[PDB]
Design a protein around this ligand. Structure first.
Ligand SMILES: C=C(c1ccccc1)[C@@]12CC[C@@H](O)[C@@H]1CC(CCCCCC)=C2c1ccccc1
Lengths: 227, 9
């Protein structure tokens, strides 16, 4: 069965069709890279609301809420992207938060050499998570582990306690629901440092483009880059 | 801060 803790995490998940329709409208309302900056900016709004909605997170005071989000926003962006490929993804395509399916080689061209490399690394993680049978229960657990980081507080006791209970619930779930997949718990946690390295490289690239004058007006994205 | 504005709403 599913631990009750994970059932509460699943309740915080955004309504996927409504998020798609909303970001779709925003983009329909400029380089392709510039359009993706807009798409990421809108995704960050959805991420902030997700955490704001969230059990546990909504108990922290604003100052603590800001630190956690400033520390993991890009990691959550990449993790969300990766899981989106795991579920809705196909070979040689990229699925966007707007619901669009684009050919990888086309969007990789538009992304340039550097970004294509990071996108390709992420696709490697997609393939590994698929072979591990990564599912939605495990996904929401990783999202909260990324959000409630210990490497970041007025209430470190809450953060530490959330981290320990989510870890225990994820171990219980993977052991009980994928017992033939040996060490699935550890194999999932291994990907968090990998995703974080990708997100650090992504931030440095976007920060470079911003200083270079290539990132159009996106106040939330830019503010998080300056955090 | 826009982020702080979002969290205070
Ligand atoms: C962090 C990104 C990004 C932000 C601003 C500009 C460009 C990318 C993402 C993460 C998921 C989507 O929001 C973004 C879209 C995407 C892949 C398509 C890039 C096409 C550019 C013309 C991102 C991504 C995914 C994996 C590794 C690095 C970036």
């Amino acid at each position: 069965s599913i631990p009750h803790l994970i059932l509460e995490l699943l309740k915080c998940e955004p309504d996927e069709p409504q998020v798609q329709a909303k970001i779709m409208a925003y983009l329909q309302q400029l380089s392709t890279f510039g359009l993706m900056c807009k798409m990421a900016d809108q995704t960050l709004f959805s991420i902030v609301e997700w955490a704001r909605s969230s059990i546990f997170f909504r108990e922290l005071k604003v100052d603590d809420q800001m630190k956690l989000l400033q520390n993991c926003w890009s990691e959550l962006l990449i993790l969300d992207h990766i899981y989106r490929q795991v579920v809705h993804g196909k070979e040689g395509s990229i699925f966007l938060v707007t619901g669009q399916q684009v050919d990888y080689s086309i969007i990789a061209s538009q992304a340039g050499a550097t970004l294509n490399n990071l996108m390709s690394h992420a696709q490697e993680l997609v393939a590994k998570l698929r072979s591990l049978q990564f599912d939605q229960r495990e996904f929401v657990c990783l999202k909260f582990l990324v959000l409630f980081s210990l490497d970041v507080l007025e209430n470190f006791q809450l953060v530490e306690g959330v981290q320990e209970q989510v870890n225990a619930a994820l171990l219980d779930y993977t052991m009980c629901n994928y017992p033939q997949q040996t060490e699935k718990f550890g194999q999932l946690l291994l990907r968090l440092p990998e995703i974080r390295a990708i997100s650090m490289q992504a931030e440095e690239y976007l920060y470079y483009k911003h200083l270079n004058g290539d990132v159009p007006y996106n106040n939330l994205l830019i503010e998080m880059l300056h955090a | 801060s826009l982020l702080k504005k979002l969290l205070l709403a």
